[PDB]
Amino acid sequence: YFKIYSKHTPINLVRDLPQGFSALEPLVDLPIGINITRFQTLLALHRS
Amino acid sequence: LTGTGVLTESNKKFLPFQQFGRDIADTTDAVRDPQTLEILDITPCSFGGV
Numbered sequence: 001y002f003k004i005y006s007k008h009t010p011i012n013l014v015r016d017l018p019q020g021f022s023a024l025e026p027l028v029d030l031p032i033g034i035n036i037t038r039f040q041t042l043l044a045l046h047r048s
Numbered sequence: 049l050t051g052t053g054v055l056t057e058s059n060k061k062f063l064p065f066q067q068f069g070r071d072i073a074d075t076t077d078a079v080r081d082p083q084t085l086e087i088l089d090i091t092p093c094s095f096g097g098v
């Protein structure tokens with residue numbers, strides 16, 4: 001099972017992580033049943 | 049979840065993921081209704097010494 005927990009927080013700090021407490025609610029449980037050992041973030045380009 | 053008790057209206061606001069509430073004795077104090085999706089508070093029956 002792939003558990004995804006998430007939290008959205010409105011912050012106003014410029015650079016680093018803010019210092020505080022925020023518990024993450026469970027969002028979605030996925031019945032995947034597969035081996036995972038590596039991950040990669042996906043970004044978006046801006047074209048002009 | 050089999051049990052015996054009195055079902056009352058529950059003031060407690062359960063989070064959407066949460067479906068059960070466990071007391072200090074790990075016994076369900078409250079259960080989220082599987083048909084009307086509301087919270088019901090279980091209290092034990094009036095046991096006493098005679």
Ligand SMILES: *[C@@H]1O[C@H](CO)[C@@H](O)[C@H](O)[C@H]1NC(C)=O
Nearest residue numbers: 032033034035036037038039
């Ligand atoms: C999962 O993948 C890793 C990396 O290849 C491997 O070492 C491991 O044996 C795999 N486990 C299973 C149960 O396939």
Ligand SMILES: *[C@@H]1O[C@H](CO)[C@@H](O)[C@H](O)[C@H]1NC(C)=O
Nearest residue numbers: 067080081082083084085086
């Ligand atoms: C059936 O279940 C849904 C939620 O699971 C609920 O909103 C609906 O009222 C139920 N229908 C009846 C007839 O109880």
